[PDB]
Ligand binder design. Structure first.
Ligand SMILES: NS(=O)(=O)c1ccccc1
Ligand SMILES: [Zn+2]
Length: 257
């Protein structure tokens, strides 16, 4: 099965998932000087006040905080998006060291980690149908740098001990994802894909320019998670990021002048 090891990592994925070499793969390097301000972008609206988190799960690749998406509770609208996109889950990608871990890069700079808030287009009824559409998903990406602690992340950090290994889950109700955002909503946007198999080309990426700061201690606890299941040889869950892919026939647009 696919993973992030030398034997099953990003360089191998194309053998099971040929779209890995496709025309709109993610992540990409964001060359800030080539990205162009787009006046046609509408104001971005992140509306998370009624979010209903449910559970946190170690899926053997990362951990997902899952939300109730049976109604328009936490939604993303505006910006490059047509219509309403509902939050279904968030997760992170991170490194073994502070100098790597992000999937997107900014002028080739790698951040320590990257948060993905995953949303599906409500016009398609469910997530499964949405991933059969070129505009099925919107992922809000947020970079993490190591510095001061992020208070809104601590509840996540403290529950990780209970989901150490693949397949473990825990209740995670009443978590407010608003606490994971930076001050500014300035962003870059481009059409791309899921960054893990099945690598489906359904995503409008919205990558915030301002990183959030998290403490060394917070990211260290991410690195104590395990890729393996309980009772199996320990393989630390680190470096669960795909590197930047060819931009090909795409333009990255900026929300800011
Ligand atoms: N990593 S990502 O593109 O946000 C992703 C989201 C949902 C499923 C698989 C991958
Ligand atoms: Zn992701």
């Amino acid at each position: 099965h696919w993973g992030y090891g030398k034997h099953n990592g990003p360089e191998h994925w194309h053998k099971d998932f040929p779209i890995a070499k496709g025309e709109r793969q993610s992540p990409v390097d964001i060359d800030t000087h080539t990205a162009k301000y787009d006046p046609s972008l509408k104001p971005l609206s992140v509306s998370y006040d009624q979010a209903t988190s449910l559970r946190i799960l170690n899926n053997g690749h990362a951990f997902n905080v899952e939300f109730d998406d049976s109604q328009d509770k936490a939604v993303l609208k505006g910006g490059p998006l047509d219509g309403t996109y509902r939050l279904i889950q968030f997760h992170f990608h991170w490194g073994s060291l502070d100098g790597q871990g992000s999937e997107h890069t900014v002028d080739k700079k790698k951040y320590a980690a990257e948060l993905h808030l995953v949303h599906w287009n409500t016009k398609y009824g469910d997530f499964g149908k949405a991933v059969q559409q070129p505009d099925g998903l919107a992922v809000l990406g947020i970079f993490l740098k190591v510095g001061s602690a992020k208070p809104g992340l601590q509840k996540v950090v403290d529950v990780l001990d209970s989901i150490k290994t693949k397949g473990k889950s825990a209740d995670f109700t009443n978590f407010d994802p608003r606490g994971l955002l930076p001050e500014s909503l300035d962003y870059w946007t481009y059409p791309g894909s899921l960054t893990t198999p099945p690598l489906l080309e359904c995503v409008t990426w919205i990558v915030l320019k301002e990183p959030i700061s998290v403490s060394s201690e917070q990211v260290l606890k991410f690195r104590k998670l395990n890729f393996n299941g309980e009772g199996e040889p320990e393989e630390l869950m680190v470096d669960n990021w795909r590197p930047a892919q060819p931009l090909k026939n795409r333009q990255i647009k900026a929300s800011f002048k």
